[PDB]
């Protein structure tokens with residue numbers, strides 16, 4: 001990795017664009033005014049990309065050669081990068097202050113600030129905008145996952161009277177559906193801030209290396225079938241595939257995809273009749289989890305439950321909701337996003353089915369179908385010092401008041417009613433509010449404050 | 465990187481689910497049912513993740529320890545992975561056949577096939593599905609970028625009579641807007657299959673390392689301002705910022721964001737009057753490129769062009785379209801996706817503005833706002849050998865005929881009219897459609913066939 005090659009091209013040319021005699025460039029990140037966001041992921045970026053000796057003679061030469069060809073001009077700040085190498089042994093003279101990871105903050109608040117600690121590196125602040133703005137992705141996955149947990153918690157509490165097993169109700173199926181191996185790890189780790197069920201193995205090693213848990217692992221899974229393990233038996237031997245699979249995993253929960261040919265037939269005739277004796281004998285700790293994987297997600301879930309309800313002993317829980325026997329559950333793992341998740345749990349409640357009956361698997365909806373636009377994650381310069389005088393800077397486009405940025409030195413505070421407020425123009429310097437909630441997390445090439453994944457999960461807890 | 469930890473969790477348990485005495489598992493990839501797709505990105509995955517010694521005793525032990533905790537049980541195939549290490553020195557006994565990279569193929573055709581070369585490794589074929597299915601991402605970026613080039617080519621031809629500078633008309637602004645550094649490189653490289661303009665520097669090194677070009681670089685950029693380089697001068701010194709920037713880059717094209725406070729005022733009064741003398745003196749090789757960055761993308765482009773048309777000398781080209789002087793252009797770099805790109809060029813044509821006047825910058829729309837669902841990229845088992853007998857395997861869900869998969873051994877052929885056809889059930893073995901278009905690209909840990917980035921670009925060319 002070469003940080004000199006880890007920026008938008010045009011940032012290579014910005015050192016010649018700032019006002020002459022500029023000694024400080026101070027910038028901030030916010031999720032411009034999903035009412036609240038989970039701050040997560042910056043510690044990964046600080047450690048993997050920004051800390052320690054990030055500048056070498058070889059990296060400067062490599063960047064110089066690439067940019068000469070890329071621009072067809074010599075515009076690269078070789079002097080500026082050589083200065084950091086000589087004066088700081090390649091360590092970045094930047095100070096980053098951030099809200100603690102896992103913190104749940106309303107939209108339009110300062111989440112982190114960045115500034116150069118040496119007047120000579122005024123240009124460095126926004127050089128690293130590209131890399132830091134990528135924190136939008138773990139913030140957005142964590143936020144969107146937590147919003148799904150709110151929906152699940154609400155319906156599980158209403159239909160059962162408690163939240164038991166809530167952290168296993170939304171499983172990450174997104175490994176194949178993301179854009180890269182790196183994204184897989186980051187995205188899966190952000191989902192694990194709220195849940196404990198994952199198939200995206202990449203997430204485990206990222207948490208282990210960059211965050212850490214008291215438990216050996218932050219996420220868990222169970223044995224499960226795929227179409228290849230069912231269909232490999234041949235179209236006429238679907239029952240043989242099912243029988244073999246539930247017998248191989250007779251003492252642990254087992255998920256079995258049942259829609260290869262006819263989901264409704266598999267539920268009613270194969271599970272419901274032919275193999276019913278292998279299901280009703282299963283432990284409460286080892287249910288069969290039937291998995292539909294096609295059709296309208298709500299219509300399929302309801303029809304599967306109505307079929308199962310007629311083949312298996314259903315009880316009525318203390319809330320008046322229908323409950324399958326404990327050796328039998330359903331996981332809907334196709335077409336799940338925050339919208340369909342809501343439609344399904346509402347549909348189940350209307351048909352008097354407890355949410356204890358179901359779990360959800362989500363791939364693209366959980367880890368890929370997200371953009372920087374969802375939370376309006378934005379990094380902007382708010383303060384500069386030029387000729388020894390600090391000036392409060394901002395943008396305010398005539399056609400879009402929503403794109404107006406904050407002015408001056410910023411600080412995040414608790415209000416008297418316990419809410420949040422971002423103080424602009426250095427007004428945090430007046431001791432009118434409590435202590436600033438932003439802490440120095442990075443300074444002059446060193447990570448100065450870190451959080452465990454356990455601390456992050458506690459911070460991200462729901463009120464319920 | 466550890467390939468034993470680079471799969472969906474449930475795939476760890478599949479070796480115990482296939483029929484006993486299974487010696488071959490053969491699977492394929494297609495973009496089920498954007499009528500044609502650019503095949504790109506597999507060579508990156510083959511080299512970075514699949515080739516050479518990918519299994520070590522340490523990797524087996526690391527996977528065993530992780531899975532024991534992740535499943536709360538011993539389900540990991542230690543014996544199977546140790547076999548590959550001992551017999552093949554950790555080289556994968558897999559054979560992958562693929563259509564050449566850059567090839568433009570209609571939907572619903574076999575793009576690549578995977579199968580084990582050792583009967584003992586029947587479980588390996590689908591172990592690597594997760595890693596290979598991630599090729600959906602470079603395929604989708606390349607396809608979506610090429611569809612935008614079709615729109616640009618059509619309107620540029622119609623309004624100017626030629627395609628000059630077409631490959632610089634859609635610039636990649638997506639570095640900050642993607643989910644990771646790895647995704648940035650992959651996505652930027654896929655855009656460069658069709659265009660030559662990029663700010664996502666990560667793309668350059670990926671192409672250099674995995675594909676290669678005759679030219680020193682596959683992509684190019686020009687100096688450009690950002691809001692921080694304008695706003696740092698203070699709200700009352702926007703003219704001073706603009707003057708400094710165009711003077712610093714007086715001999716190369718320069719892009720200048722002009723919407724910090726009032727885009728229309730900046731065009732009419734600042735560029736159009738106060739600084740007009742610094743613009744009209746510019747070389748044809750060094751235009752000022754005015755950049756709006758907010759408001760309705762079409763309304764803003766049209767209004768900016770009407771303002772500029774009244775302040776600067778406009779000509780009528782040979783097609784009857786309005787053309788700004790050669791030292792002045794516009795780039796729309798906000799809210800650009802395939803839909804808005806179409807709306808803008810159509811809007812310009814209706815108001816008699818040549819597409820030579822404009823270029824587009826696209827970030828999230830080009831590299832992030834995409835999913836595996838857009839082209840229905842899918843990997844499925846189509847053929848297995850059990851007890852020495854080959855059987856044609858497929859799925860066919862009752863509620864979704866679109867999810868029906870292909871049967872048996874597959875082959876890709878040219879039809880008599882020069883179109884494409886995927887032959888199923890080993891029917892390619894009959895010499896009726898001639899030679900199979902898929903080539904062995906990977907075999908037993910080695911890449912057996914590769915393409916340069918130059919070969920890929922030629923293959924991906926538009927007919928026009």
Ligand SMILES: CC(C)(O)C(=O)N1CCC(c2ccc(NC(=O)n3cc4ccc(F)cc4c3)cc2)CC1
Nearest residue numbers: 168171173199221222224255329331358359472474
């Ligand atoms: C249902 C209840 C009571 O909430 C519960 O007991 N649990 C515990 C068991 C839990 C679980 C965990 C993993 C799986 N996995 C699968 O179905 N697969 C993994 C996949 C990965 C990728 C993919 F494309 C498809 C997949 C199918 C099922 C269920 C749900 C909650």
Ligand SMILES: CC(C)(O)C(=O)N1CCC(c2ccc(NC(=O)n3cc4ccc(F)cc4c3)cc2)CC1
Nearest residue numbers: 008010632635637663685686688719793795822823
């Ligand atoms: C206009 C015409 C004739 O098609 C032409 O001459 N060319 C040549 C010059 C070309 C070009 C190349 C790069 C840039 N860059 C920028 O504006 N920035 C790069 C950014 C990256 C990220 C971001 F958030 C904002 C950005 C602003 C402008 C223009 C357009 C086609």
